[PDB]
Amino acid sequence: TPDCVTGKVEYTKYNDDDTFTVKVGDKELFTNRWNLQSLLLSAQITGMTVTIKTNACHNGGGFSEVIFR
């Protein structure tokens, strides 16, 4: 499938409101869809390594496809 990398949380530069620029999983970039904060939080809270993918996944990537963990 058109997936990409993982989604841990070692630095989430927030500024937009929820989008922010996440430096986690295996890369760092802007992220917008509808509420990725809950995914970055639930991830590190429960663990910290989801799955970031789709929408390029590089410099403004990862749109609506992420696996929690």
Domains for the chain: give ranges and CATH numbers: 1-69 (2.40.50.70)
- Give me the phi and psi of 47, to 5 degrees please: -160, -95
- For the chain, what is the radius of gyration of the CA atoms? 10
Token pair recorded at residue 57:
């996944």
Q: How far is CA 6 from the centre of its chain?
A: 8
- Tally Cβ neighbours within 10 Å of residue 47: 12
Alpha-carbon gap, residue 46 to 31, rounded angstroms: 21
Q: What is the DSSP letter of 25?
A: T
SS3 of residue 50 by DSSP: strand
Tell me the torsion sign for CA atoms 43, 48, 53, 55. positive
The C-alpha angle with vertex 41 and arms to 36 and 46, in degrees rounded to 5, equals 130
Q: What are phi and psi of 37, to 5 degrees?
A: -55, -50
